[PDB]
Amino acid sequence: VVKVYGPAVAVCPQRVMACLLEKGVEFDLVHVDLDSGEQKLPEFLLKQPFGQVPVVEDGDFKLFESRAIIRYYAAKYEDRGPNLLGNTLEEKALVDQWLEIEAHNFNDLVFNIVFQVVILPRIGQQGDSELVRTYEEKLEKVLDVYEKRLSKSKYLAGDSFTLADLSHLPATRYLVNEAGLGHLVKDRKKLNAWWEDISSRPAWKKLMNLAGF
Amino acid sequence: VVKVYGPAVAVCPQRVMACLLEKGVEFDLVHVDLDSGEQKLPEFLLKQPFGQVPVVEDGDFKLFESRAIIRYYAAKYEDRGPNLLGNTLEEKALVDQWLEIEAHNFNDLVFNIVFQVVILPRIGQQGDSELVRTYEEKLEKVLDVYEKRLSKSKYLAGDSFTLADLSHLPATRYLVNEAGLGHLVKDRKKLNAWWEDISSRPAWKKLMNLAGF
Ligand SMILES: Oc1cc(O)c2c(c1)O[C@@H](c1ccc(O)c(O)c1)[C@H](O)C2
Ligand SMILES: Oc1cc(O)c2c(c1)O[C@@H](c1ccc(O)c(O)c1)[C@H](O)C2
Ligand SMILES: N[C@@H](CCC(=O)N[C@@H](CS)C(=O)NCC(=O)O)C(=O)O
Ligand SMILES: N[C@@H](CCC(=O)N[C@@H](CS)C(=O)NCC(=O)O)C(=O)O
Ligand code: NA
Ligand code: NA
Ligand code: NA
Ligand code: NA
Ligand code: NA
Ligand code: NA
Ligand code: NA
Ligand code: NA
Ligand code: NA
Ligand code: NA
C-alpha cells in the first residue's frame, strides 16, 4: 500500500491524493507537520531531500515531485478508471501542455497569493497586500487565456477530464475560499462552470471530506 | 518540417532545439524578437497566448510549454536516437521527478539570477545584487542535493542521459558563463563532471555553434 507523506490540508499532497482516488489506488496518509517545520529536519530530508511534501513510498519505490507522482500513477493504472493522460501522443502532449501551464503560469501566482493572504497570517505575519495586488492583476490575464480555451474545449486538454484539470483542484479551492478571490473564477463564465464541474467529482469530494473542506 | 519559434540564444527555445537535435528531428527556427517585445503583440499571441517562447508548429499540430514539447518529441521519436524518457514506468518516473526538480527548485532560482545579472543590464536597468545574493544562497542548497544524487548515479535520473539532464543545459550555461556563477558547479565535483559531460554532447555543441556560445 502506497504511503503518501504530508498534511491532508496541503495543496501538493492533495494533488497526489486526488490522482490516487481517481485511479482507485489504496493509500495510507502519513501527516508531516509543516506548521512545526518537520519537513526540514533530518528524518524527513532522507525521504524528500529538498524538505518539501509530498513524497510517496510504494514498496521499495520512492518518488517525489507531485506532478511526477500523478503522471506515474496515471500510467501505472492507465487501464483502470478515468483516462487521465490522453490516448494519442498529441492528446498526451496537450495534457502535458496544460500541466505545464498549471505548474508555472497559474501556480506561481496562486501560491504567492495564498502564501501572503492565508499562510503568513497564521504564523503572525502580515501579508504584503500591495504585492498580492500585483499577483491578482497578473492572474486575471492568465485566467483570460483559460476562459478563451474553455470557450473552445470542455476541459483544458480536450473534451474529457485529465491530469491537466485535476492538477488545478487543490490550489484553486484555496484561491476561491480562504484567499477570498472567488471573483477570479466567478467573473469568467466558462471557467466558473469548469470549476463547479471538476470540484464536484466524487474523488475530490471524498478528499475534501477527509481534509475538512 | 517542425517550426520552432524564439531566439536561438534564449533558454526555453534552446531546451526544445536540444531535444530535436538529439532525436534527429529536422526543424526551421523562426526568430521572435524578445528584445523588442514581439512576443507580446497580437500576431504572436495567436501562437502562444501567454506571450512567451517557444511554440512549435508541426503540420497542423501546435504545442507550447518547452517541457511539454520535449516530452512530445522524445515520445514521438522514442525508437530513434537516445532513449531520453526511460523504459520502465519507474525509470520514466525518475526522469519526470528530475524534470520537476529542474523546472521549479533549480530554474526558479537560475532564471531569477540570470534576469537580474544578465537581462536587466542589457536594457539599462541595474540588477538587485542583494536579491541575487539571496538566490545564490538558496541555489547552493539546491545544488548540494544534486551533488549527493550524482555521487550515487552517473546522471540525474539513472545511469544514462535523459530529458532530465537535457533540460538543464540552456540555463546552466548562462549561470556559469554570463552570470559569473561558475563556482556553483565547479565547487561540486560530481556536478562539475556531469556538466562537462552533458555540455560536450555533439547535439549541444551544434546548437551552441548556431547560437554563438
Ligand atoms: O510554507 C508553507 C507551509 C504550508 O503549510 C503550505 C505552503 C507553504 O504552501 C501551501 C500552498 C498554497 C497554495 C499553492 O498554490 C501551493 O502550491 C501551496 C500549502 O497548501 C501549505
Ligand atoms: O524577459 C526575458 C527576455 C529574454 O530575452 C529572456 C528571458 C526573459 O529569460 C531568459 C532566461 C534566463 C535564464 C533562465 O533560467 C530562463 O528560464 C530564461 C531567456 O534566455 C531570455
Ligand atoms: N515542486 C514540489 C512543490 C512541493 C511543495 O511546495 N510543497 C509544499 C506543500 S504544498 C511544502 O512542503 N511546503 C513547505 C516548505 O516548503 O517548507 C511538488 O510539486 O511536489
Ligand atoms: N513555462 C514556459 C516558459 C517560457 C518562457 O519563459 N520563455 C521566455 C524565454 S526563455 C520568454 O518568452 N521570455 C519573454 C517574456 O516572458 O516576455 C516554457 O517552459 O515554455
Ligand atoms: Na515533492
Ligand atoms: Na510546484
Ligand atoms: Na490598491
Ligand atoms: Na490555448
Ligand atoms: Na486535517
Ligand atoms: Na512556451
Ligand atoms: Na518555466
Ligand atoms: Na553582500
Ligand atoms: Na535524490
Ligand atoms: Na543568434
Numbering used by the authors:
A (entry chain A), B (entry chain A): 2 to 214
Pull verbatim passages from the article behind this deposition.
Through biochemical and structural analysis, here we show that anthocyanin-related glutathione transferases, currently implicated only in anthocyanin transport, catalyse an essential dehydration of the leucoanthocyanidin dioxygenase product, flavan-3,3,4-triol, to generate cyanidin. Using PtGSTF8 from poplar as a model enzyme, we use biochemical, structural and computational methods to demonstrate that arGSTs employ a GSH-dependent Brønsted base mechanism for conversion of the LDOX product flavan-3,3,4-triol or flavan-3-on-4-ol into flav-2-en-3,4-diol (8-B4), an equilibrium form of cyanidin.
The structure comprises the typical GST fold with an N-terminal thioredoxin-like domain (β1α1β2α2β3β4α3) and an all-helical C-terminal domain (α4α5α6α7α8). The active-site cavity, which is located between the two domains, comprises a glutathione binding site (G-site), formed mainly by the N-terminal domain, and a hydrophobic substrate-binding site (H-site), which is formed by the C-terminal domain. However, presumably to accommodate (−)-catechin, the active site is substantially enlarged by a shift of the α4′′ and α4′′′ helices by up to 1.71 Å and an upwards movement of the side chain of phenylalanine F112. Within the H-site, the substrate analogue interacts through hydrogen bonds to N108 and the backbone of V12, a π–π interaction with F112, water bridges to R16 and Y175, and hydrophobic interactions with V12 and V115. To shed light on the interactions of the enzyme with the natural substrates, we docked flavan-3,3,4-triol and flavan-3-on-4-ol into the active pocket of the crystal structure of PtGSTF8 obtained with (−)-catechin. The docking analyses revealed that the positioning of the GSH-thiolate in relation to C-2 and O-3 of the docked substrates could enable an acid–base mechanism of dehydration or tautomerization, in which the GSH cofactor acts as a proton-relay system.
